[PDB]
C-alpha cells in the first residue's frame, strides 16, 4: 500500500538521522573505549556483572538494519553503553571517566536530535 510505503519512508529518513547522531556520538568518544563489544575473553565474568552489553559497533548494525523505530530506543542504546561502564568500572579508572564525559557531551547532540525529531516529525 501507499500508506506503508510512506510509513517506511519516514523510517528510512529517521535512521538517516540517528547515523549522523550516531556519528556526533561517537566523536566523543576519541579514545574508541565504546567502539566494540567488551571482549568475553579478555573479559571472561563480564556477563556475570552486565546483562545487557552494548557498544557503538552494535548499534550501528541495528541501526543499518532500521531497528529503530523512534529515538527513544537509541537513546536506550546509548544510556546502556554509559550506564554499563559506569557499574563494571570504578570511578578513578580512565573507563569511567570516558563515560562521564561521553554522557555530558552526548547530552548536547541529543538536546538538539529531539528537537529535530519532533520538528521534522520522524515519529
Same mark, same amino acid.
Given at each position: 500500500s501507499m500508506e506503508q510505503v510512506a510509513m517506511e519512508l519516514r523510517l528510512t529518513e529517521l535512521t538517516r538521522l540517528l547515523r549522523? *547522531? &550516531? $556519528? @556526533? &556520538? #561517537? $566523536?566523543?568518544?576519541?579514545?574508541? /573505549?565504546?567502539? @566494540?563489544? =567488551?571482549? %568475553?575473553? +579478555? =573479559?571472561?565474568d563480564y556477563l556475570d556483572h552486565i546483562k545487557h552489553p552494548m557498544d557503538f559497533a552494535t548499534m550501528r548494525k541495528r541501526l543499518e538494519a532500521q531497528g529503530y523505530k523512534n529515538l527513544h530506543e537509541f537513546e536506550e542504546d546509548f544510556d546502556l553503553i554509559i550506564d554499563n561502564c559506569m557499574k563494571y568500572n570504578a570511578r578513578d579508572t580512565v573507563f569511567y571517566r570516558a563515560a562521564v564525559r561521553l !554522557? $555530558? #557531551?552526548?547530552? =548536547? *547532540? &541529543? !538536546? @538538539?536530535? !529531539? !528537537? +529535530? *525529531? $519532533?520538528? /521534522?516529525? %520522524? +515519529?
Open positions: 549522523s *547522531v &550516531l $556519528d @556526533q &556520538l #561517537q $566523536d566523543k568518544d576519541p579514545a574508541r /573505549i565504546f567502539a @566494540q563489544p =567488551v571482549s %568475553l575473553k +579478555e =573479559v571472561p !554522557r $555530558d #557531551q552526548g547530552g =548536547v *547532540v &541529543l !538536546r @538538539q536530535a !529531539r !528537537r +529535530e *525529531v $519532533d520538528s /521534522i516529525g %520522524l +515519529e
